[PDB]
Amino acid sequence: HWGYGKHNGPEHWHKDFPIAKGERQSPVDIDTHTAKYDPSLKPLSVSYDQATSLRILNNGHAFNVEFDDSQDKAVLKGGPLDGTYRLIQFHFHWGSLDGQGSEHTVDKKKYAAELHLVHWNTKYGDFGKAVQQPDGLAVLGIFLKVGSAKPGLQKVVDVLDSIKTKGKSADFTNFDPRGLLPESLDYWTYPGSLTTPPLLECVTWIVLKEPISVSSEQVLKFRKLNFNGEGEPEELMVDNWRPAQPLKNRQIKASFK
Ligand SMILES: NS(=O)(=O)c1c(F)c(F)c(S(=O)(=O)CCc2ccccc2)c(NCc2ccccc2)c1F
Ligand SMILES: [Zn+2]
Numbered sequence: 001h002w003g004y005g006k007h008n009g010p011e012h013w014h015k016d017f018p019i020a021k022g023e024r025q026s027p028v029d030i031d032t033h034t035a036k037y038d039p040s041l042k043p044l045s046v047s048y049d050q051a052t053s054l055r056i057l058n059n060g061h062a063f064n065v066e067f068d069d070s071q072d073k074a075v076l077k078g079g080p081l082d083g084t085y086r087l088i089q090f091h092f093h094w095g096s097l098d099g100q101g102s103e104h105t106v107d108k109k110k111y112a113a114e115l116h117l118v119h120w121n122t123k124y125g126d127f128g129k130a131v132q133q134p135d136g137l138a139v140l141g142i143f144l145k146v147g148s149a150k151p152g153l154q155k156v157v158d159v160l161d162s163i164k165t166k167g168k169s170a171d172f173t174n175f176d177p178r179g180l181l182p183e184s185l186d187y188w189t190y191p192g193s194l195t196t197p198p199l200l201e202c203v204t205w206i207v208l209k210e211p212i213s214v215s216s217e218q219v220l221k222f223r224k225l226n227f228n229g230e231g232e233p234e235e236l237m238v239d240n241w242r243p244a245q246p247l248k249n250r251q252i253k254a255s256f257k
Pocket of ligand 1: 059062064088089091116118127131139193194195196197198199203
């Protein structure tokens, strides 16, 4: 029932998910001036050489690219993390226009979209148990701006016509997520939450400072997806982002400068 409209969007979520008004909600505005450089933070370690993609899925509010996480393949560690987090899936949030789309903002600046690479803490054994823990997930957020195409995203864009509507899926093997990363791994990090229902407060957010560039034609294809299922009135999948939430009693830390 929740979604992104006037009647079921982010401002309504608290009625079914009271944690929406909780103490460590995401996304947030990253105030670059008050983010403290933390010389104790490590370089982030992103090991995606063995990643195995399985499927791509329109789940009715984004598209997910899913990975086989049953072995220790694609892992995120280092950075602020005390453990080993395993890649499970990635997805995006984007706008109806280039001027909006991202969930995190940087000195109130909105990017055209934001990629989330979602990983779960291997000390909890699986994703479903990890989300019940305050250090259960690590989500790597990467901003998208519109400019030159990202060659490494084109395979994703090209398959979207095949999962236009909610609940459609498609085989999606041998996709290499290393092709979606920017050159620098400088990052901001803070404790936060899933940004859609159930809004669980289980996420260490690591947001890269350097955005990737995608082309206007690439992001236009994201906007041709549908929130509705096949045979229902067409509602374009756009603006599936939650606005910035109160920082409350949290410090955003920077890995750089
Ligand atoms: N935007 S996000 O990165 O914080 C996020 C959520 F907000 C979130 F609620 C979830 S969820 O699985 O608990 C609910 C549904 C969902 C699915 C895909 C994108 C956004 C929300 C995931 N988890 C992603 C996920 C999906 C399937 C299997 C494992 C992880 C998730 F990654
Ligand atoms: Zn997300």
